[PDB]
Structure formats: structure tokens, C-alpha cells
RNA sequence: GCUCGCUGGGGAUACUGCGGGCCUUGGGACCGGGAGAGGCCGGGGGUACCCCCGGGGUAGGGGUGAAAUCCUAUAAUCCCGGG
């Protein structure tokens, strides 16, 4: 068939967003970009704007490297942490769409525990 | 009348006590088909989390209302193959 398809792993949280493009197997990295080096203040890294910028940069790198199609994999921290993706997940996906990348299957691979470890914060939780 | 009562006799047998007899309603015993995170012992699993090694890859990661401490160039966050 001769089409180079990859996988875009999106790590979305309430503090930062990471976009990482890799080959079909996932063992070879193509482009890794996040909001930390795109924005300046720590409060704007998880912003959808920073998500769009980082996803766009990763898309340009992948296109120059010779990637046309990609399968999305959204991921929240999961485990004992939050189970909900951050604001910069759909923004990153649509930025990848805008940059000129074909999008195949879209899935959430957040690690869900089957009554695993104890979450942080104590029994009373955070009281701010 | 009071000394809250004691004592010698006679009568009663509904009730209570005592002795005997006859029952099953309360409660126990037993059989039948089922229900349940009731308890103990043994054997096989679920992802998740943490660590270690081998590859990919650069400069960030984390965290907050905002920051900082902290981890990171001895190759971090993140992805993959394994223990």
C-alpha cells in the first residue's frame, strides 16, 4: 500500500499537555512536543491554546519526516490520579487535524485501576 | 380502734405451692428443594501503581490561586520490548 501511518499519544492533565508522535509500533519516536517549551508561564501550559501550538509543531515535524496518517491515543493520568482528560485534548486533536494529518481511530487509553493503590491526599482529601 | 401481728381448732378448694396422670399451641430435633460479600484453609487470576535493565528521543518534567522546593544532561517527562 505504501502509506506511512503513525500514532499520536496525547497525555492530558490539569497542569500540562504532551503530544508525542511515533511510528505504528510505538517503539520509534518521530516528534515530541509539549506546552512547556511553547508557552512561558506555568499557568498557560495546560491551556488549549498551548495544546494547539504544540500539536501543530509536532504535526509539522511529522509531515517533514514523511507522515500522512495517524491514530490518536488520548490519555489522562489515570491510576490513582484524575481519570478525566484535561482541556488540551480535543484542542490538540483538532490542531492535528488542521495541520494536515489524516486521523484514523480515536481512543482513550487512560489506565483504569481495578481497585488498585491508595490516592494521595489523606482520608479528608485536599481542603483549600 | 391501735399495738402493722402470734397461736389452738373446724370448713372451703376458685387461685398459687406440692405429688401423679394426659396433651401440643411456645421452644427444641429431623427430612426435602432452594438463597446469601456468614467463617476457615488451599490453588489459580485482574488491571493499576512502584523499581530495575534494553531500545526511541531531546530539554524539560512536576506542582500551585501564583510560585517555589524537588526530578532532569550520569539523557529526565513520554513510547516500546522484558524482569
From Swiss-Prot:
GO biological process: one example: translation
GO function terms (MF aspect): rRNA binding; structural constituent of ribosome
Top-rank taxon, per record: Archaea
Isomerase is among the record's keywords: no
Keyword Ligase tagged: no
InterPro entries documented for this protein: Ribosomal_uS11 (IPR001971), Ribosomal_uS11_archaeal (IPR019961), Ribosomal_uS11_CS (IPR018102), Ribosomal_uS11_sf (IPR036967)
Keywords: Ribonucleoprotein, Ribosomal protein, RNA-binding, rRNA-binding
GO CC terms of this entry: ribonucleoprotein complex; ribosome
Pfam families reported in the protein's UniProt record: Ribosomal_S11
Region (Disordered): 107-128
SUPFAM superfamilies: Translational machinery components (SSF53137)
Family assignment from sequence similarity: Belongs to the universal ribosomal protein uS11 family.
NCBIfam families the UniProt entry points to: arch_S11P (TIGR03628), PRK09607.1 (NF007176)
Record text on subunit structure and interactions: Part of the 30S ribosomal subunit.
Task performed by this protein: Located on the platform of the 30S subunit.
Protein name: Small ribosomal subunit protein uS11
Organism, as annotated: Pyrococcus furiosus (strain ATCC 43587 / DSM 3638 / JCM 8422 / Vc1)
Amino acid at each position: 500500500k505504501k502509506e506511512k501511518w503513525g500514532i499520536a499519544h496525547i497525555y492530558s492533565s490539569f497542569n500540562n499537555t504532551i503530544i508525542h508522535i511515533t511510528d505504528i509500533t510505538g517503539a520509534e519516536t518521530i516528534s515530541r512536543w509539549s506546552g512547556g517549551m511553547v508557552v512561558k508561564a506555568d499557568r498557560d501550559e495546560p491551556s488549549p491554546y498551548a495544546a494547539m501550538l504544540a500539536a501543530r509543531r509536532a504535526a509539522e515535524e511529522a509531515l517533514e519526516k514523511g507522515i500522512v496518517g495517524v491514530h490518536i491515543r488520548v490519555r489522562a493520568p489515570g491510576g490513582s490520579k484524575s481519570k478525566t482528560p484535561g482541556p488540551g485534548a480535543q484542542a490538540a486533536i483538532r490542531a492535528l487535524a488542521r495541520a494536515g494529518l489524516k486521523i484514523g481511530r480515536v481512543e482513550d487509553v487512560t489506565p483504569i485501576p481495578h481497585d488498585g493503590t491508595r490516592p494521595k491526599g489523606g482520608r479528608r482529601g485536599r481542603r483549600v
